[PDB]
Amino acid sequence: MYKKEYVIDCKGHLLGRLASLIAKELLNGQRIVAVRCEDINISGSLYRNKLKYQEFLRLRTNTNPKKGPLHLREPSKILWRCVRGMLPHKTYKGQLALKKLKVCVGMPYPYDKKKKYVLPSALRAFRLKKHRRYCRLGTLSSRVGWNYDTLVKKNEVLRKQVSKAYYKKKVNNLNEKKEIKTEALNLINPEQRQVLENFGY
Amino acid sequence: KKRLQNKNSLTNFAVRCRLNPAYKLLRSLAVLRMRKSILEKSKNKKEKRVQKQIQKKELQKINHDYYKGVAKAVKKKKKREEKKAK
Amino acid sequence: IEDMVYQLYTCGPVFKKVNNFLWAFKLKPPRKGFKAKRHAFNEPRPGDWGNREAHINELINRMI
Amino acid sequence: KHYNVKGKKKVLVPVNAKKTINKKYFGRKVASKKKYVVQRKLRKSIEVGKVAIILTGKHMGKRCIITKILNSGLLAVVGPYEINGVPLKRVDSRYLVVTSTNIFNFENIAKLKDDFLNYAQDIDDDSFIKTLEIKKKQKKLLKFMNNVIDKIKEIRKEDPKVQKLEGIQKDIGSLLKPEILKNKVFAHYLKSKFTLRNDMVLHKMKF
Amino acid sequence: LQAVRLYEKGVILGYKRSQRNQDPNFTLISIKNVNTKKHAQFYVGKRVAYVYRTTKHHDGVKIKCIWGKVCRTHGNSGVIRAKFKTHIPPKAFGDRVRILMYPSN
Amino acid sequence: AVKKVGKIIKKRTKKFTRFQSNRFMRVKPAWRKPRGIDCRVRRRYKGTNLMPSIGYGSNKKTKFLLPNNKYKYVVKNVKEMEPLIMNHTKYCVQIAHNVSSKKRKQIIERAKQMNVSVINAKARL
RNA sequence: AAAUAGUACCUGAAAUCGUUAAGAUGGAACGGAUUAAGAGAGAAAACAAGUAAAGAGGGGAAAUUCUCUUCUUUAUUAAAAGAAACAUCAGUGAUUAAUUUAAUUUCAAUAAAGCAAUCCCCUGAAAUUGUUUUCACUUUCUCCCCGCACUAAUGUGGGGAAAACUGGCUUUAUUUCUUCAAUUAUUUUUUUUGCUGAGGAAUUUUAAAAUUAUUUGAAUUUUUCUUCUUAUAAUUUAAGUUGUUUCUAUACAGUACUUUCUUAACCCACUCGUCUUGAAAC
RNA sequence: CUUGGAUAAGGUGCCUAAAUAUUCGCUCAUGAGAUCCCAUAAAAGGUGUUGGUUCAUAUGAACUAGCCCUGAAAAUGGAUGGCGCUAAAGCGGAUUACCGAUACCAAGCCAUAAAAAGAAAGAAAAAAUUUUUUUUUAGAAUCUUUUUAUGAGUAGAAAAUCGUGGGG
RNA sequence: UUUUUGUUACUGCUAAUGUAAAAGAGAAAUUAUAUAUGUACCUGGUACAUAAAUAAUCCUAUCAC
Ligand SMILES: [Mg+2]
Ligand SMILES: [Mg+2]
Ligand SMILES: [Mg+2]
Ligand SMILES: [Mg+2]
Ligand SMILES: [Mg+2]
Ligand SMILES: [Mg+2]
Ligand SMILES: [Mg+2]
Ligand SMILES: [Mg+2]
Ligand SMILES: [Mg+2]
Ligand SMILES: [Mg+2]
Ligand SMILES: [Mg+2]
Ligand SMILES: [Mg+2]
Ligand SMILES: [Mg+2]
Ligand SMILES: [Mg+2]
Ligand SMILES: [Mg+2]
Ligand SMILES: [Mg+2]
Ligand SMILES: [Mg+2]
Ligand SMILES: [Mg+2]
Ligand SMILES: [Mg+2]
Ligand SMILES: [Mg+2]
Ligand SMILES: [Mg+2]
Ligand SMILES: [Mg+2]
């Protein structure tokens, strides 16, 4: 929390645990960008969570539905709303905290070339026993009218191909630098080599 | 009289000896026997094992018998009840 | 002061006078809290209000 | 002088009483009634030849060598001006971090402790306070913003305490420079300053 | 490559409070690498500086500082309670402070 | 809050303003004690006006001293300031509001010769 | 004399409106606590007595002698105060590392020598406490037979043997190879640190107590803190804070210090008066 | 009226100061559950799952009680306080640390109540060189020093104090 | 659409500043969780290799003139 910006990919994280750890960071003052929000997980059966969204859909201002609850249904706006409900967003400071969060579906440019972090205290693999039921956020949001699940998958395929080529070139570079390093160790005075060996560098 | 600071009667040596005219002697004697015993590491503490051999053998049989008897009584009560329950 | 310590620790012939000579002691709260002043010491729960025979020393060393 | 209560042996040094106050119902008197005071008892890592790091002044970051304990608590250091740029200087021991490395542990240098200690005797505590007349001379110059600076630097150079202290500084540097330069890595260590880098946490470090 | 650091970084949280009451005499600080109660005790005497900027000149300069002290810990996670000479304004609650290392031991 | 300069301590500096005097202009700011059922200031609700009490009183040793660290005495002519020649270190003088300039010049000139300070020796110049 | 005293004519408040300037402004506005950022004012504590040479005045005493003071320059000189840092002491807390002597069925290890094999310190099952007698109670990385690779197992299922490596007990001298725990009772110390400093004793801040260095004698615990004010001096641990440097500053109101307004933040805040068991009240 | 320390009731996933603490069990709900007052649920059922008792040669039964489920239908759109939570952030225990009052403890100050005393009086310091210069040199009885404990208030009662037109 | 110095007689003015966050604010495979990734060959399979308290780590920084 002493950095200009943290990039998280939300693939495989539970919605509530992740949203509770983002909100405290934002309140302490830290820009956060969250990507791949369509891969978020929730901890019930898919039917059960669809029932909950159906209940959320049927509450509206009786006299004029233009007001009242707005039923956002993109998978990233849902994380945005769940985070908003863990903040005091009706004060000036708590409204400043909310504006420091950026959410995306997929992985657009500025961030496909950055470093992504995870939060093990919220990973599904570590928190949920293996005979329990769970669902995927993209499937649920497509069931209630989102319509872009296929396109982001098609885009992610190409992104992963480009990343694979990058990784190949990088591994070649590290090997070619390691050989140079191991050759240059014999050209140094023995005292520097001994002190480097003692501390394992 | 005007009131002054109330001094800590335990950790302030002058007032502690003011209230108790015997504390100096007691503290000095305690310090003396403290220094004696710590100076006797690896010179004494060697026979204290000998007195262990002296009196723990004396008390061991009595203690062993007492606890043996308590345990046997508890067991006899168990068997006496189990026989009755049939 | 040692004379009245003696007369208090053992019920000496002068106990009524020595005890009545002192102001009532005013003490701090304990340093690690109570358990539950609602319930008794001898109850199978956390509680405080019974007669705790020799464990009073530990408590009143934490509020002295 | 000393007093000994419960086996502690606190040391006593004389102290003067200065401030005056009002009496209750006739003329005034001095407040303090004490005549001695307890000394300071510096911490058990300040020795004569150890290296240290200045933390506060114009020379923050720079390394130096302890030289003397100055009878008023604080202490004098040189990081030899010939090697470092740090002159004879008086510092509070509470603004220093002291390492575990000693000059007089190198066998190349350990033979010169006595000639170092003979020079350090003349280092004095009164020689560091500038007299009133020098203050008056410098402060008259405020009545072009570049001539005043060197004019101030020139009034300082003619204070006999400054000249006396500079002589000892030169003698120490001349004695101790040639042997230090023989240890290449150590001289480089003395010529550089200390900084904090991330991935070192300051409550697991040792230095 | 210049301007050495010689301090650890910190962030000023709010006041010492409960739910619904404030008590602005003390303030809460977070230190960068410290996240246990026992490691926070290491810093319990150091001086704290809060540096900020203004828009007018005040004594020839546009920077001023408020000085404080590290007094105690705040429980199980490495937060500390600090006391300043004046009260910190509430418009500072995510800003930066310097936990110095002057009173060296 | 508390203000302290030397040995003089003031426990509070803000005034006590009358309840509801910010909302109605027929109500003047001078303090009046609230009487009447359902007041919320008489009953000490949190978040409203405070009441004055004897607790805020000042130290008896420093109760009427000015920042000058002296007491104030108001004079109307040259002869009224005769007693100040014996206690010229504990008192300072102030000139009354309805004395003419000619009288003020004389008063100031005598106060200087007595080594007593004048608080307002710049009026009507 | 004065017309912002022009006849609706002394003074000329509040409600209400105009002009200019400076701010604020997502379905009320004001307010309490606490600070910050701006703007306007300010020297009576928020530095310098005095000395020396003039220049201009104003008094007192014995129209000539001495003496006292206020202003203006010029050049010389101290003192005092507030704040910060460091240190010393005292009062009240946090934090870490130990310790004397006892009690209360504790243990564990290193040499050698031995005792018993379903056997041992124990535990179990049968034949009011004490006693006696039977049968069970170990697995090994060994062997044999059957299944012949059968197992989750770099092995395994069923049935038989042996051994005392392992486990238990006994003699002895060991305890820095290693152990000497835990809980109470009773004593003595230590690392790093937060907050506070009321008072000012013309004769109780004294007496006493403690300390240190010379002494006059006796003990015992036999000693560089061993006791008993059985003689003089000093000191504080007694008898509620003292010191050293720096800054403000070689200033005369400056962007610094004091103060009053304005506008933000964080926490909090229903409309008064009245009758009523009960009022923010539809 | 304040400064500092440590608590009670209750809490420690975010809103919100302090445990995504440790150590044992139970529970899956196509209308789960979430602790005084307190903001509803029954008779009768279950071949859900977990413990226990009693009978019959390694199966068959009969009972018992914990969580879960059926029984369970109303009118604007809505409420374990909200988000949410299933290696719990749920239910029944245990072991520690921590956060938290105008209540508790140590210190200062204001007022109220009581108390110990007082109606005979004399030189202290600093700055300058063994003479000058500053500050003080007290004695008002409903008064002056010093000490301890205490402080909620409608109807109602009393004392002290502040201001206005006239008179001596 | 380079750089240097600055934003310390009057009519509203006619020269003109801000910051919710600099002090190394360093860090681009993918996938699974009763397992993974890379290479080679067949048409997912076979063989070999490599990680497995993996940020509890790598990189970067003082040598002036
Ligand atoms: Mg605690
Ligand atoms: Mg509790
Ligand atoms: Mg009750
Ligand atoms: Mg006032
Ligand atoms: Mg009422
Ligand atoms: Mg006229
Ligand atoms: Mg007239
Ligand atoms: Mg609108
Ligand atoms: Mg044998
Ligand atoms: Mg709020
Ligand atoms: Mg509210
Ligand atoms: Mg009534
Ligand atoms: Mg009615
Ligand atoms: Mg009402
Ligand atoms: Mg109603
Ligand atoms: Mg408090
Ligand atoms: Mg929190
Ligand atoms: Mg049947
Ligand atoms: Mg709740
Ligand atoms: Mg909760
Ligand atoms: Mg009352
Ligand atoms: Mg009338």
Side-chain angles (χ1 to χ4, degrees), chain A, chain B, chain C, chain D residues 1-5 7-207, chain E, chain F:
Chain A
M1 78 156 284
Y2 297 78
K3 203 180 273 286
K4 190 181 149 182
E5 193 205 31
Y6 265 109
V7 179
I8 299 170
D9 51 324
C10 302
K11 179 179 181 290
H13 290 74
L14 295 180
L15 165 74
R17 315 248 170 194
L18 170 71
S20 162
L21 295 156
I22 294 171
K24 193 57 183 183
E25 288 289 334
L26 289 168
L27 270 172
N28 284 343
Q30 166 78 80
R31 307 302 189 120
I32 300 282
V33 171
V35 297
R36 293 167 108 194
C37 293
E38 87 272 2
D39 288 327
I40 289 166
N41 277 122
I42 308 170
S43 74
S45 89
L46 171 69
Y47 188 94
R48 188 170 167 83
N49 286 125
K50 193 179 177 295
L51 278 172
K52 278 169 178 189
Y53 202 86
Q54 276 300 327
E55 302 193 290
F56 177 56
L57 266 178
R58 75 166 287 266
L59 56 87
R60 76 181 80 88
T61 309
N62 177 237
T63 53
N64 197 358
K66 279 186 284 190
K67 303 141 161 46
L70 306 177
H71 306 91
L72 283 71
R73 66 197 73 187
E74 310 166 36
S76 48
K77 292 293 195 299
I78 286 161
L79 172 71
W80 180 85
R81 210 185 188 263
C82 185
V83 173
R84 196 271 299 272
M86 276 152 201
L87 295 180
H89 68 94
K90 277 186 175 155
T91 56
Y92 175 73
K93 179 183 185 297
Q95 181 82 0
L96 291 160
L98 179 60
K99 292 276 189 186
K100 298 183 185 171
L101 159 76
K102 182 161 169 62
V103 288
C104 305
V105 62
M107 188 180 290
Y109 156 63
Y111 318 114
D112 64 351
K113 286 188 162 81
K114 299 276 182 58
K115 166 66 173 184
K116 275 73 70 178
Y117 292 86
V118 298
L119 317 179
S121 181
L123 279 172
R124 176 172 70 88
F126 279 78
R127 301 296 317 186
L128 190 66
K129 276 169 164 135
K130 262 77 185 175
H131 58 287
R132 305 306 188 193
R133 301 190 177 272
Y134 66 100
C135 69
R136 173 181 175 263
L137 186 48
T139 312
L140 172 77
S141 82
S142 77
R143 298 273 216 268
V144 293
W146 171 44
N147 283 330
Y148 290 117
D149 199 18
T150 294
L151 174 73
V152 299
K153 287 180 196 190
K154 190 176 72 212
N155 283 349
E156 284 299 285
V157 167
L158 275 296
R159 186 186 72 73
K160 282 190 234 203
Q161 283 157 30
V162 164
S163 184
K164 189 173 182 177
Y166 156 77
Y167 185 65
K168 267 205 176 303
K169 193 186 289 183
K170 181 204 193 182
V171 167
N172 288 329
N173 281 114
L174 281 71
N175 293 342
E176 196 268 329
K177 185 176 180 180
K178 163 185 191 44
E179 290 331 299
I180 302 278
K181 166 144 147 175
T182 187
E183 179 204 29
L185 270 167
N186 297 113
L187 273 67
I188 300 299
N189 283 7
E191 310 88 0
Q192 277 79 73
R193 201 177 47 220
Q194 187 164 348
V195 66
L196 280 184
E197 264 165 42
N198 166 65
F199 291 106
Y201 286 104
Chain B
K1 292 181 181 180
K2 175 91 186 78
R3 69 171 292 276
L4 278 297
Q5 196 89 73
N6 286 328
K7 307 288 195 170
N8 189 312
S9 162
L10 274 169
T11 69
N12 194 327
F13 189 68
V15 299
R16 174 90 175 258
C17 291
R18 185 161 94 199
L19 295 163
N20 189 11
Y23 179 63
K24 197 205 178 159
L25 187 153
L26 300 162
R27 190 199 156 257
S28 77
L29 292 190
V31 172
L32 262 191
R33 73 186 154 260
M34 178 138 58
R35 270 193 263 121
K36 186 180 289 293
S37 179
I38 62 170
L39 189 148
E40 300 302 320
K41 286 296 185 182
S42 174
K43 278 74 69 177
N44 278 130
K45 67 184 288 184
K46 299 296 289 183
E47 301 90 357
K48 301 180 200 141
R49 318 198 315 255
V50 159
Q51 293 83 18
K52 180 262 287 181
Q53 287 70 240
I54 296 169
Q55 64 265 14
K56 292 182 181 179
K57 301 307 291 179
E58 294 178 354
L59 283 178
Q60 186 42 258
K61 189 76 171 147
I62 298 172
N63 289 347
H64 188 271
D65 288 344
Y66 189 74
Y67 291 110
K68 184 142 181 86
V70 170
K72 186 65 68 67
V74 165
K75 185 173 179 177
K76 298 280 287 298
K77 175 75 196 288
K78 179 174 73 69
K79 305 306 286 179
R80 188 151 59 245
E81 286 300 320
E82 270 171 345
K83 183 183 279 283
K84 183 142 57 188
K86 281 187 179 178
Chain C
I1 189 170
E2 292 294 321
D3 285 1
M4 46 210 293
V5 164
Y6 176 84
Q7 302 274 341
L8 283 171
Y9 178 67
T10 68
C11 274
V14 179
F15 183 91
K16 194 188 171 79
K17 299 302 183 182
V18 169
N19 192 40
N20 201 6
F21 192 34
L22 295 157
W23 207 277
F25 296 77
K26 281 144 54 75
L27 316 170
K28 317 192 288 179
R31 190 261 173 267
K32 304 267 208 201
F34 292 112
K35 298 281 185 70
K37 315 194 282 187
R38 223 170 271 285
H39 294 292
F41 196 74
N42 290 350
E43 267 187 66
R45 315 171 50 150
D48 291 331
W49 58 254
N51 164 0
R52 62 179 89 193
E53 292 154 334
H55 307 281
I56 192 78
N57 304 279
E58 170 270 317
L59 167 71
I60 79 176
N61 263 283
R62 290 194 288 130
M63 53 196 315
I64 193 66
Chain D
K1 309 281 190 190
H2 71 109
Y3 68 71
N4 192 338
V5 171
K8 186 74 71 67
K9 201 149 295 172
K10 317 223 187 160
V11 178
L12 306 176
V13 294
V15 70
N16 42 45
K18 166 144 197 151
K19 182 182 275 288
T20 44
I21 54 172
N22 276 328
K23 194 76 70 68
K24 192 158 89 166
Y25 61 84
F26 64 102
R28 321 165 43 88
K29 73 180 172 77
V30 296
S32 178
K33 67 178 73 67
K34 64 175 73 68
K35 304 175 187 297
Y36 293 98
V37 68
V38 169
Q39 215 173 47
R40 182 167 312 220
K41 187 173 285 185
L42 301 174
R43 70 181 173 278
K44 183 62 65 68
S45 67
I46 291 146
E47 277 299 317
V48 187
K50 286 190 148 184
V51 301
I53 303 149
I54 296 95
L55 298 176
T56 44
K58 178 148 91 74
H59 323 276
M60 70 173 70
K62 280 294 183 78
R63 278 151 179 141
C64 55
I65 317 289
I66 294 171
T67 311
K68 203 196 156 93
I69 297 89
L70 267 183
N71 200 6
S72 63
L74 72 165
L75 60 85
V77 300
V78 292
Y81 179 89
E82 295 72 9
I83 281 153
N84 213 1
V86 178
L88 285 171
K89 187 182 158 21
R90 201 171 51 150
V91 305
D92 189 318
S93 83
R94 182 69 83 171
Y95 295 106
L96 290 173
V97 58
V98 172
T99 70
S100 60
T101 292
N102 212 308
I103 294 298
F104 304 119
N105 275 331
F106 294 101
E107 61 86 20
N108 184 240
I109 297 184
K111 62 179 189 298
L112 301 164
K113 181 185 280 287
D114 304 72
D115 302 334
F116 186 83
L117 287 183
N118 286 354
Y119 281 142
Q121 278 186 359
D122 294 321
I123 290 167
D124 193 335
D125 189 358
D126 206 302
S127 66
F128 283 101
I129 303 94
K130 66 181 180 181
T131 61
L132 190 56
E133 69 275 16
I134 296 295
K135 277 185 189 180
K136 293 219 156 188
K137 289 178 61 166
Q138 279 166 325
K139 291 179 175 218
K140 285 207 314 301
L141 285 159
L142 317 170
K143 302 311 281 290
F144 281 169
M145 63 290 291
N146 212 8
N147 305 323
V148 190
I149 285 288
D150 61 297
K151 199 75 72 178
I152 289 162
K153 296 201 169 185
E154 182 65 26
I155 299 181
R156 180 179 179 270
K157 296 279 282 189
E158 65 183 1
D159 187 331
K161 303 166 108 184
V162 167
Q163 295 142 12
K164 190 182 102 77
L165 208 64
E166 184 95 13
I168 311 177
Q169 173 188 313
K170 173 187 176 62
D171 283 271
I172 293 285
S174 297
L175 169 65
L176 189 62
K177 180 206 210 181
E179 290 296 311
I180 287 180
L181 294 175
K182 279 191 211 302
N183 293 108
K184 191 185 191 294
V185 184
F186 182 67
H188 282 299
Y189 169 68
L190 272 175
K191 282 178 179 287
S192 76
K193 57 183 74 175
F194 165 75
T195 181
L196 272 169
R197 316 286 285 162
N198 41 39
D199 189 359
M200 76 202 197
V201 306
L202 201 63
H203 63 261
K204 308 169 106 75
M205 293 177 71
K206 279 167 176 52
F207 64 99
Chain E
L1 278 75
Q2 57 193 356
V4 296
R5 199 171 102 214
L6 301 186
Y7 60 80
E8 182 67 273
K9 303 171 177 178
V11 160
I12 48 186
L13 306 174
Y15 293 136
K16 175 172 86 81
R17 56 178 286 186
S18 67
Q19 204 198 341
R20 309 165 186 122
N21 294 116
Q22 208 60 346
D23 189 0
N25 271 344
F26 286 89
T27 180
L28 307 184
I29 319 292
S30 169
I31 319 170
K32 157 142 168 185
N33 279 314
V34 193
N35 43 45
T36 64
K37 179 171 76 149
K38 189 160 292 291
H39 289 152
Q41 185 71 32
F42 179 94
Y43 302 79
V44 73
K46 298 291 187 274
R47 286 167 83 196
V48 175
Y50 167 56
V51 176
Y52 61 97
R53 299 180 192 104
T54 70
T55 61
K56 324 283 189 182
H57 303 269
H58 281 293
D59 189 358
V61 310
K62 279 184 282 198
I63 297 89
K64 49 170 72 178
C65 175
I66 303 175
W67 279 99
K69 185 70 66 66
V70 179
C71 293
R72 54 187 286 177
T73 62
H74 198 66
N76 296 115
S77 284
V79 188
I80 61 167
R81 299 192 204 178
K83 183 159 176 58
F84 285 87
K85 293 182 183 293
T86 50
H87 294 153
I88 297 286
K91 63 183 285 291
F93 278 173
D95 203 359
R96 167 79 82 230
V97 287
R98 304 181 175 194
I99 304 156
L100 280 300
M101 64 180 288
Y102 297 168
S104 179
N105 71 62
Chain F
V2 175
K3 160 179 164 95
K4 180 184 178 192
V5 177
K7 295 183 182 292
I8 304 167
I9 284 177
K10 319 269 183 185
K11 299 178 169 165
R12 177 192 168 107
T13 57
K14 286 194 58 188
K15 299 299 202 282
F16 293 85
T17 62
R18 186 169 162 174
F19 177 52
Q20 296 294 321
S21 73
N22 49 314
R23 289 192 172 159
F24 301 97
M25 64 184 73
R26 64 181 177 265
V27 173
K28 277 162 215 152
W31 167 256
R32 297 279 182 280
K33 180 154 201 40
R35 299 181 181 100
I37 66 170
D38 311 346
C39 186
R40 82 171 65 248
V41 163
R42 171 182 86 69
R43 293 199 277 168
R44 272 89 71 90
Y45 282 18
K46 58 176 307 207
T48 44
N49 285 325
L50 311 185
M51 290 195 250
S53 65
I54 202 66
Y56 297 90
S58 294
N59 195 328
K60 277 191 285 319
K61 281 162 216 279
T62 70
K63 177 155 180 211
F64 302 100
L65 306 161
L66 306 192
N68 189 359
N69 189 359
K70 305 172 174 170
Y71 305 106
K72 178 182 74 171
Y73 190 70
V74 189
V75 301
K76 284 180 273 287
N77 46 36
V78 170
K79 182 174 72 68
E80 269 201 345
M81 65 180 288
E82 183 178 1
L84 301 154
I85 209 159
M86 293 324 314
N87 46 15
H88 77 296
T89 55
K90 288 294 190 313
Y91 282 78
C92 52
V93 310
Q94 182 182 238
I95 309 189
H97 75 296
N98 59 4
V99 298
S100 54
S101 291
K102 151 168 57 163
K103 193 69 65 69
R104 279 189 194 241
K105 285 171 169 70
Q106 285 165 12
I107 293 183
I108 277 165
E109 179 205 70
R110 178 170 293 288
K112 179 60 216 293
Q113 298 165 357
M114 270 203 273
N115 273 314
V116 311
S117 52
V118 186
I119 293 312
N120 59 340
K122 277 179 191 171
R124 297 191 185 189
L125 291 173

